[PDB]
Structures are given as structure tokens and as C-alpha cells.
Design an enzyme around this catalytic site. Structure first.
Site, mmCIF file in Angstrom:
data_model
loop_
_atom_site.group_PDB
_atom_site.id
_atom_site.type_symbol
_atom_site.label_atom_id
_atom_site.label_comp_id
_atom_site.label_asym_id
_atom_site.label_seq_id
_atom_site.Cartn_x
_atom_site.Cartn_y
_atom_site.Cartn_z
ATOM 1 N N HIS A 42 -0.259 -14.937 3.801
ATOM 2 C CA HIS A 42 -0.984 -13.673 3.756
ATOM 3 C C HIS A 42 -1.757 -13.461 2.465
ATOM 4 O O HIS A 42 -2.395 -12.415 2.297
ATOM 5 C CB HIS A 42 -0.056 -12.467 4.042
ATOM 6 C CG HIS A 42 0.987 -12.180 2.999
ATOM 7 N ND1 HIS A 42 2.289 -12.625 3.111
ATOM 8 C CD2 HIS A 42 0.954 -11.402 1.889
ATOM 9 C CE1 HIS A 42 2.998 -12.167 2.096
ATOM 10 N NE2 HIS A 42 2.219 -11.423 1.340
ATOM 11 N N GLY A 93 3.856 -7.847 -6.051
ATOM 12 C CA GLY A 93 3.554 -9.000 -6.870
ATOM 13 C C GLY A 93 4.566 -10.126 -6.773
ATOM 14 O O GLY A 93 4.249 -11.252 -7.185
ATOM 15 N N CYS A 133 5.865 -11.592 -3.964
ATOM 16 C CA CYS A 133 5.670 -12.554 -2.880
ATOM 17 C C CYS A 133 5.372 -13.946 -3.415
ATOM 18 O O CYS A 133 4.646 -14.119 -4.402
ATOM 19 C CB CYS A 133 4.522 -12.129 -1.958
ATOM 20 S SG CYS A 133 5.068 -10.783 -0.971
HETATM 21 C C1 LIG Z 1 3.937 -9.365 -1.219
HETATM 22 O O1 LIG Z 1 2.851 -9.507 -0.364
HETATM 23 C C2 LIG Z 1 3.452 -9.278 -2.583
HETATM 24 O O2 LIG Z 1 4.261 -9.066 -3.474
HETATM 25 N N1 LIG Z 1 2.042 -9.346 -2.776
HETATM 26 C C3 LIG Z 1 1.384 -9.217 -4.043
HETATM 27 C C4 LIG Z 1 1.004 -7.789 -4.396
HETATM 28 C C5 LIG Z 1 0.299 -7.448 -5.551
HETATM 29 C C6 LIG Z 1 -0.029 -6.119 -5.842
HETATM 30 C C7 LIG Z 1 0.326 -5.094 -4.980
HETATM 31 C C8 LIG Z 1 1.038 -5.405 -3.822
HETATM 32 C C9 LIG Z 1 1.371 -6.729 -3.537
HETATM 33 C C10 LIG Z 1 4.678 -8.052 -0.769
HETATM 34 C C11 LIG Z 1 6.077 -7.868 -1.418
HETATM 35 C C12 LIG Z 1 6.669 -6.500 -1.071
HETATM 36 C C13 LIG Z 1 5.979 -5.330 -1.781
HETATM 37 C C14 LIG Z 1 7.091 -4.416 -2.328
HETATM 38 N N2 LIG Z 1 8.308 -5.213 -2.221
HETATM 39 C C15 LIG Z 1 8.111 -6.381 -1.504
HETATM 40 O O3 LIG Z 1 9.020 -7.202 -1.299
HETATM 41 N N3 LIG Z 1 4.764 -8.102 0.606
HETATM 42 C C16 LIG Z 1 4.101 -7.251 1.465
HETATM 43 O O4 LIG Z 1 3.434 -6.348 0.972
HETATM 44 C C17 LIG Z 1 4.162 -7.459 2.977
HETATM 45 C C18 LIG Z 1 2.930 -8.239 3.442
HETATM 46 C C19 LIG Z 1 2.804 -8.426 4.933
HETATM 47 C C20 LIG Z 1 1.599 -9.283 5.360
HETATM 48 C C21 LIG Z 1 4.032 -9.075 5.486
HETATM 49 N N4 LIG Z 1 4.283 -6.155 3.612
HETATM 50 C C22 LIG Z 1 5.473 -5.475 3.543
HETATM 51 O O5 LIG Z 1 6.404 -5.787 2.809
HETATM 52 O O6 LIG Z 1 5.537 -4.365 4.384
HETATM 53 C C23 LIG Z 1 6.376 -3.259 3.961
HETATM 54 C C24 LIG Z 1 6.153 -2.772 2.509
HETATM 55 C C25 LIG Z 1 7.092 -1.966 1.869
HETATM 56 C C26 LIG Z 1 6.909 -1.500 0.564
HETATM 57 C C27 LIG Z 1 5.769 -1.822 -0.152
HETATM 58 C C28 LIG Z 1 4.803 -2.622 0.461
HETATM 59 C C29 LIG Z 1 4.981 -3.085 1.769
#
Ligand SMILES: *[C@](O)(C(=O)NCc1ccccc1)[C@H](C[C@@H]1CCNC1=O)NC(=O)[C@H](CC(C)C)NC(=O)OCc1ccccc1
Ligand SMILES: *[C@](O)(C(=O)NCc1ccccc1)[C@H](C[C@@H]1CCNC1=O)NC(=O)[C@H](CC(C)C)NC(=O)OCc1ccccc1
EC number: 3.4.19.12
Lengths: 299, 297
Positions: free
Chosen positions: A39, A141, A143
Site C-alpha cells: 500500500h 509511520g 508500517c
Molecule cells: C501504515 O500504513 C503506516 O504506518 N503508513 C505510514 C504513515 C505515515 C504518516 C501517516 C500515516 C501513515 C499504517 C499503520 C497504522 C497507523 C496507526 N497505527 C497503525 O498501525 N497503516 C494504515 O494506515 C492502514 C493502511 C491500509 C491500506 C491497510 N490502515 C489502517 O490501519 O486502518 C485503520 C487505522 C487506524 C488508526 C489510524 C490509521 C488507520
């Protein structure tokens, strides 16, 4: 007994950042390949229901920014394997350890090196819950951060982080991109099954208590595996597998207590409770120390 | 979750040090290896070692230092309090930016547990108010070090020397001075009465709120002194105004005044947890600092 992580240095030497557009997450650089969550190629609009195959066709090598620190690593090929993106790069990581990709079972533990922008922040020990979530500290951040075990000189990578569920727990894939549990990488509401207690680890904990001289709970009886499993499920404990019985082998040999005799002791604890007593200085049974974890810290 | 610093920068400094039949770990920074001085003791010596006398009888070649498969030649040695300093003929290219600090009780640090110069595990510890640490250390762990990391700089604060009969641990700073009233002789030593690190329990309670947990909150408040009277009754450390200040960010973040959280903690101390749990724990946790919590939330 401490939650003790593996030393993280061999994994620190493999962390990079991967950026598409403005989306930056972490990746794992081993030999000449960088592994990361697919993603990274999504915009916010794609994330509600991404067409990953269509999104990837529109990408070229020159759309991916891979950095080790501030040093760019040139991408020379790209492909998707389930939910992970593999970026071929023109430099073999000189810090590549001996490694394996393994898919762990629920109950197994591993260390997570939590990273942000390719920079390690902390290391901690996690257990894979029977419902295929982990209880961790992952912020925006994180992921692409990975979970691992280290055996001798060899790092076994078992987890790559992708998402947080409504309840605050976390979900992700192995390094071949296959999710643990029924989850998908879409920004949709998804629910983990009700969780259960990791029976094999509770047994490991009782063996640890015996090793340390705390053995009031040992009874004179035994049970069959089937009878124990049917009882255990009524208390929201996982049933035991043959593999669970086998990985308790070393602790059973160390203590001389057959696995099924310990099962009968646990069954009595479940049916009668602690009656105010403690085990290893606690009235709660611990389920996040595997039989290997117990061996590590006792021996 | 309890989070340790990434240990790579310290792993590249761990070596094995052997004198006689005694082997433990050393820390190799630039061209010096630091290790516990009791590596020079024998079975006999350990009960009442006259270290200056035992050391003057040693030569450089009585010390075997091994970095992996390579032996490092000792070209000089000296003693600073309970630490031996071995000068070697080659510099460690993996030496990080570093400093030696002496931490205060209530502060936390990471431990890289090592055996035979090889890293085995990493975990987070706090310096207890009675200057022990509740570690996980076996035979061969002596010379393992504790540290914090700020920017790219490793602040070493602990070298491991001893396990007390109660199972807790004692050691020194990297100048070789023990934390606490302990002595590097082979005798059963007791610590002073331990107390609970109150500012850390409060940070941990705030952490539990942040993660959507507040069954323990209440509508009451308390003055600082009245809270401290109760705290001391229950062998909790007193809370200072600098502790209250340090807790501001967590108070702002959650909208819960520090002294309101003190009133909740007071209630917990007097009543107990009544079977309940906070962040999974049946007991109040006191080894997260306010900084640890803030960084992780
Ligand atoms: C992950 O995508 C990530 O860390 N991306 C980099 C980033 C940089 C700046 C801002 C946001 C993200 C992220 C990890 C999540 C966020 C909060 N805690 C985590 O473990 N993963 C996601 O955002 C998921 C991506 C989809 C395509 C699967 N979405 C997700 O987790 O859905 C629920 C959610 C809950 C809280 C916050 C954000 C999303
Ligand atoms: C530490 O010396 C060490 O790891 N040495 C290398 C070694 C030791 C034994 C076999 C092989 C190699 C050791 C660390 C201890 C051992 C168990 N867990 C630990 O954390 N430290 C010591 O043994 C102390 C040495 C003194 C001279 C400082 N001794 C000690 O801890 O004694 C405690 C004690 C308890 C009861 C009665 C008398 C002493």
C-alpha cells in the site's frame, strides 16, 4: 521473568524507507531486494478499495524512492507478491545477515523493531494472538516494520506490519505478503475474532514455575489430550495441537512431568481457580512466554 | 508495551574477556575494553579480594580479549573503582558516539544481556530507589551494560556485576562505582527497603487512559502533601513539584490534572484493584517514565 527481545542490530542494518509520492513507510533490504507493504503505492483515495494490480501497472521503477538514511538506493525492478512489494535495487546490502522467511503459528513470540522513516525507535517482544493480531506500539509511520526471531546467526523474519484494527490491536503479513488471519489491506472496518488464551504458553509458564520450585498445583492425575481440549475450550483456552505437545517436550524432560499430567494440573486450576494462591508471584496465568522463551531465560 | 532501545550500536562493542578460568563480557570503545574487575579473582579470592594486590600481580598477557574470532592484544591495563580498563592495540571501528552517565533512581535504561561476548537479549529496566535493578541475568552476564540512546549518542549508565539472594541485581556505572551499598565480594548482600516509583506509576496510569482505559479514575482530587502522606505510608516515593511539572504533557494530552490522577492512585492504594487489571497488569507498574510514555504515545 522479563519480556526479553532479541538483539536488534542485525535487523537495524536492513531497515530502509520507501516513498511513493508523499507516502513513506519502512522497507527491509536483504541482498539486492527491498520488501515493503504494497500500500505504499496507494493514495488516500485508493485505500478505501484499492485496485493494487491497476495501481502497480501505472508505476515504474523511477516512481519509487528507496533510502538508507539519506542515501538513495536505485530501484531496477518491481513486482508484487501477495500484499508485499519487492523492489530490486542495484546494490546488495553489505549488512545482510544470514536469514530465512518463516510463517509463525499463533502463540509464537517474536521481537518487533519499531521503525519510523527507516529509523529504528525501539525493540519489543510480541506474541501472535490466536486471533492473529498482536498487541504492539505502532504509530503512523510504522508500517513496514518487521518482526523476527534469531536462531544462532540466522534471522528468521516472520512479520511485516500493515495496519491497526478498530480495537487498537495490529495486523500484518509474513514476508511473502500473506496476511496472518482474515484481514485485507483495505481501509475498511474489519474485526478480529474473539481472542483466546494461549494454552501452550500457559503450560510453559507452569513448567517454569516448577523449575523455580513453585509446584503446589501439581496433582496426582492425568488426562487425554481430547478431554483436556474439550474442557479448555469452555474456558476460552485454545486447544492443543500435536506440535504444542512436542514443543513442550524439553520442559517436560527437564522437570519429569509429562505434558498430559501438566494438562491435568491446568484443568484443575481452570475448574477450581487459584483459591487465593499465586504462581511465580502472580494470581494470573501468563500466556505470552513460549516454551523457548522459558528455556532462554532459565538456562 | 515495554520498549527497549535498538541495541545494534552496543552489540558492535561487546567482546569476551578471560583471565584464568574466569570469562565475562567487556565493552570495547575506541582502543579500551571496560569490564568488571572481578574477572581477576579465583574461587579463593572472591570472598575478600584485595583488588589492588591481586591486580599488581597480573600481566597484560594474563588477559585474553576476543572480538568474535579475533584476539585483541592487551598493551596496558588500569583499574578505576570496580572496573578494569584494558588498553588494546586496535581501535573499534564500530565505536558509536557515546558518553558515560550516572543515572538517578527512577530513571529507565535498556540492558543488552550478553554471554561470552555475544548479545543474547535486550530489555528495559529501571534503577530502583534502593539502587537495585530487576534484571534477567545468568552466570556469564557480568560486563553486560545498560544504556540509553539520544540522537546517535549512546549514554552508558550500567555495567552488571552481581545477583543478590532475592534475585535482583546490582552493578556499577562506567566509572566503576556501584549503585547502592553493594560490594564486589562473594557475599550475600541485602538491599535497603525498596519503594515504588510514584511518578512512573502516574505516567503508566496516564498511558492506560490514552489507550482508552479509565475504570480507576474518580471525581475526587487531593493536595500534593496529602497525597504524599498516603504514598509514604504505602512505601511509595514522594512526588515532587518537578515530577508534577514533568507530568504536564500527559496531563494536557488527557485533560486530567496531575493531582486528579494522584487522587485515583490514592484510591487504588487504599482499596486495591478489586480483581481488575490495568493495561493487562494485576499490579501497578512503575518502570515507565513520563518520557517513555510520551515517546510511545
Ligand atoms: C501504515 O500504513 C503506516 O504506518 N503508513 C505510514 C504513515 C505515515 C504518516 C501517516 C500515516 C501513515 C499504517 C499503520 C497504522 C497507523 C496507526 N497505527 C497503525 O498501525 N497503516 C494504515 O494506515 C492502514 C493502511 C491500509 C491500506 C491497510 N490502515 C489502517 O490501519 O486502518 C485503520 C487505522 C487506524 C488508526 C489510524 C490509521 C488507520
Ligand atoms: C558475574 O560475575 C558473572 O557473570 N561472571 C562470569 C561467570 C560466573 C559464573 C560462572 C561462569 C561465568 C556474576 C553474575 C551473577 C551470576 C548469576 N546471576 C548473576 O547476575 N556475578 C557474581 O557471581 C558475583 C561476583 C562478585 C565477586 C561481584 N557474585 C554474586 O552475585 O554473588 C551473589 C551472592 C549470593 C549469595 C551468597 C553469596 C554471593
Amino acid at each position: 521473568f522479563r519480556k526479553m527481545a532479541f538483539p536488534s542490530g542485525k535487523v537495524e542494518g536492513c531497515m530502509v524507507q520507501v516513498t511513493c509520492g508523499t507516502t513513506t513507510l519502512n522497507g527491509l533490504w536483504l541482498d539486492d531486494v527491498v520488501y515493503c507493504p504494497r500500500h505504499v503505492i496507494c493514495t488516500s483515495e485508493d485505500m478505501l478499495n484499492p485496485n493494487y494490480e491497476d495501481l502497480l501497472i501505472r508505476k515504474s521503477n523511477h516512481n519509487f524512492l528507496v533510502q538508507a538514511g539519506n542515501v538513495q538506493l536505485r530501484v531496477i525492478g518491481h513486482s508484487m507478491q501477495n500484499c508485499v512489494l519487492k523492489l530490486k535495487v542495484d546494490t546488495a546490502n553489505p549488512k545482510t545477515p544470514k536469514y530465512k522467511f518463516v510463517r509463525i503459528q499463533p502463540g509464537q513470540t517474536f521481537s518487533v523493531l519499531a521503525c519510523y522513516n527507516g529509523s529504528p525507535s525501539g525493540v519489543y517482544q510480541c506474541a501472535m494472538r490466536p486471533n492473529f493480531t498482536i498487541k504492539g506500539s505502532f504509530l503512523n509511520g510504522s508500517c513496514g516494520s518487521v518482526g523476527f526471531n534469531i536462531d544462532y546467526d540466522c534471522v528468521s523474519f516472520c512479520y511485516m506490519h500493515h495496519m491497526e484494527l478498530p480495537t487498537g490491536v495490529h495486523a500484518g503479513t509474513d514476508l511473502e505478503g500473506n496476511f496472518y488471519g482474515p484481514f485485507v489491506d483495505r481501509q475498511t472496518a474489519q474485526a478480529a475474532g474473539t481472542d483466546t488464551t494461549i494454552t501452550v504458553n500457559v503450560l510453559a509458564w507452569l513448567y517454569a514455575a516448577v523449575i523455580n520450585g513453585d509446584r503446589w498445583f501439581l496433582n496426582r492425575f492425568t488426562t487425554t489430550l481430547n478431554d483436556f481440549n474439550l474442557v479448555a475450550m469452555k474456558y476460552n483456552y485454545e486447544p492443543l495441537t500435536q506440535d504444542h505437545v512436542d514443543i513442550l517436550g524439553p520442559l517436560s524432560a527437564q522437570t519429569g512431568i509429562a505434558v498430559l499430567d501438566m494438562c491435568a494440573s491446568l484443568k484443575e486450576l481452570l475448574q477450581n481457580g487459584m483459591n487465593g494462591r499465586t504462581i511465580l508471584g502472580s494470581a494470573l496465568l501468563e500466556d505470552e512466554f513460549t516454551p523457548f522463551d522459558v528455556v532462554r531465560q532459565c538456562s
